[PDB]
């Protein structure tokens, strides 16, 4: 859950563009946070069959991100995956 300084934390961590508030980094960050949140949501929501309803779209955009993120900046590939925590 974000807050005033949590926003500042997310922005100082991820977004570093002329508009570091709605930058790709923060949006993929929120896309990944949404996936995680929704997965823990679905682990409670047993009433929601056809699960991963809109999570498949995000998983798809996350795997599509490969030839986009890495291509428009080689550092952003490896460093946004570092930021998100895809390194493990």
Swiss-Prot record:
It comes from the Bacteria. GO terms for molecular function: rRNA binding; structural constituent of ribosome. Keywords: Ribonucleoprotein, Ribosomal protein, RNA-binding, rRNA-binding. One of its GO terms (cellular component) is cytosolic small ribosomal subunit. One of its GO terms (biological process) is translation. One of the primary rRNA binding proteins, it binds directly to 16S rRNA where it helps nucleate assembly of the platform of the 30S subunit by binding and bridging several RNA helices of the 16S rRNA. Forms an intersubunit bridge (bridge B4) with the 23S rRNA of the 50S subunit in the ribosome. NCBIfam families: S15_bact. Part of the 30S ribosomal subunit. Forms a bridge to the 50S subunit in the 70S ribosome, contacting the 23S rRNA. HAMAP family: Ribosomal_uS15_B. Belongs to the universal ribosomal protein uS15 family. This is Small ribosomal subunit protein uS15. It comes from Thermus thermophilus. The lineage of its organism: Bacteria, Thermotogati, Deinococcota, Deinococci, Thermales.
